[PDB]
Paper text:
The condensin protein complex plays a key role in the structural organization of genomes. Based on their homology to ATP binding cassette (ABC) transmembrane transporters and the Rad50 DNA damage repair protein, the two globular ATPase “head” domains situated at the ends of ∼50-nm-long intra-molecular coiled coils of a heterodimer of condensin’s Smc2 and Smc4 subunits are thought to sandwich a pair of ATP molecules between composite catalytic sites, each composed of Walker A (P loop) and Walker B motifs of one head and a so-called ABC signature motif of the opposite head. Each head domain (hd) can be subdivided into a “RecA”-like lobe that contains the ATP-binding pocket and a “helical” lobe that merges into the coiled coils; they connect the heads to a half-doughnut-shaped “hinge” dimerization domain. Smc2hd and Smc4hd are furthermore connected by their binding to opposite ends of the Brn1Cnd2/NCAPH kleisin subunit (Onn et al., 2007).
Because Ycs4 has so far been thought to assemble into the condensin complex exclusively through its constitutive interaction with the Brn1 kleisin subunit (Onn et al., 2007, Piazza et al., 2014), we mapped the part of Ct Brn1 required for Ct Ycs4 binding to a high-affinity (Kd = 0.70 nM) core region of ∼175 residues (Ct Brn1336–512) and to an extended region that includes the preceding ∼110 residues (Ct Brn1225–512). To reveal the interaction between the Brn1 kleisin and Ycs4 HEAT-repeat subunits at near-atomic resolution, we solved the co-crystal structure of Ct Ycs4 bound to Ct Brn1225–418 to 3.3-Å resolution (Ct Ycs4-Brn1Y4). The structure revealed a hook-shaped conformation of the 21 HEAT-repeat motifs of Ycs4, with the low-affinity binding region of the kleisin subunit (Ct Brn1241–299) winding along the concave surface of the HEAT-repeat solenoid and entirely filling the space between the two lobes of the sharp U-turn in the C-terminal part of the Ycs4 subunit. A marked drop in the quality of the electron density map in the second lobe because of crystallographic disorder only allowed modeling of a polyalanine chain into unaccounted electron density alongside the tip of the Ycs4 U-turn, which presumably corresponds to the high-affinity kleisin core binding region. Localization of selenomethionine residues based on anomalous difference maps and secondary structure prediction nevertheless allowed the assignment of residue numbers for almost all of Ycs4. A feature apparently unique to Ycs4 is an α-helical extension of HEAT-repeat motif 10 (“proboscis”), which showed, however, no apparent primary sequence conservation among Ycs4 homologs.
Author numbering: 241 to 274, 278 to 299
Amino acid sequence: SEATLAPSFASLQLKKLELEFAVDPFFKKASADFGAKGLLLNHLMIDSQGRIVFDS
Protein backbone atom coordinates (compact mmCIF):
# COMPACT_ATOMS: atom_id res chain seq x y z
CA SER A 1 0.00 0.00 0.00
CA GLU A 2 3.13 2.15 0.24
CA ALA A 3 3.45 3.15 -3.41
CA THR A 4 -0.31 3.20 -4.04
CA LEU A 5 -0.86 5.81 -1.32
CA ALA A 6 0.33 9.38 -1.62
CA PRO A 7 2.25 11.10 1.19
CA SER A 8 1.17 14.08 3.26
CA PHE A 9 -1.79 15.06 1.04
CA ALA A 10 0.41 17.91 -0.14
CA SER A 11 1.14 15.87 -3.26
CA LEU A 12 -2.64 15.96 -3.91
CA GLN A 13 -3.02 19.58 -2.71
CA LEU A 14 -3.78 22.77 -4.56
CA LYS A 15 -4.32 26.41 -3.65
CA LYS A 16 -5.39 28.30 -6.79
CA LEU A 17 -9.04 27.60 -7.66
CA GLU A 18 -10.54 28.20 -11.11
CA LEU A 19 -12.96 30.84 -9.84
CA GLU A 20 -14.45 31.64 -13.18
CA PHE A 21 -15.10 35.43 -12.96
CA ALA A 22 -17.11 38.16 -11.27
CA VAL A 23 -19.26 39.65 -14.00
CA ASP A 24 -21.32 42.58 -12.69
CA PRO A 25 -25.13 42.14 -12.60
CA PHE A 26 -25.72 45.71 -13.80
CA PHE A 27 -23.86 44.71 -16.97
CA LYS A 28 -26.11 41.66 -17.37
CA LYS A 29 -29.26 43.79 -17.06
CA ALA A 30 -27.89 46.49 -19.38
CA SER A 31 -27.28 43.84 -22.04
CA ALA A 32 -30.93 42.78 -21.82
CA ASP A 33 -32.33 46.33 -21.81
CA PHE A 34 -30.18 47.73 -24.64
CA GLY A 35 -31.29 50.19 -29.45
CA ALA A 36 -32.12 53.90 -29.30
CA LYS A 37 -34.86 53.14 -26.78
CA GLY A 38 -32.38 51.60 -24.40
CA LEU A 39 -30.11 54.59 -25.11
CA LEU A 40 -27.89 53.56 -22.12
CA LEU A 41 -28.92 56.75 -20.33
CA ASN A 42 -32.59 55.71 -20.25
CA HIS A 43 -31.47 52.41 -19.05
CA LEU A 44 -29.45 53.67 -16.12
CA MET A 45 -30.59 54.70 -12.71
CA ILE A 46 -29.57 57.67 -10.68
CA ASP A 47 -27.78 57.43 -7.36
CA SER A 48 -28.30 58.82 -3.85
CA GLN A 49 -25.00 60.70 -4.13
CA GLY A 50 -26.16 62.03 -7.50
CA ARG A 51 -24.37 59.85 -10.07
CA ILE A 52 -25.24 57.14 -12.61
CA VAL A 53 -24.73 53.60 -11.33
CA PHE A 54 -23.09 51.13 -13.72
CA ASP A 55 -20.41 49.79 -11.35
CA SER A 56 -21.78 47.97 -8.30
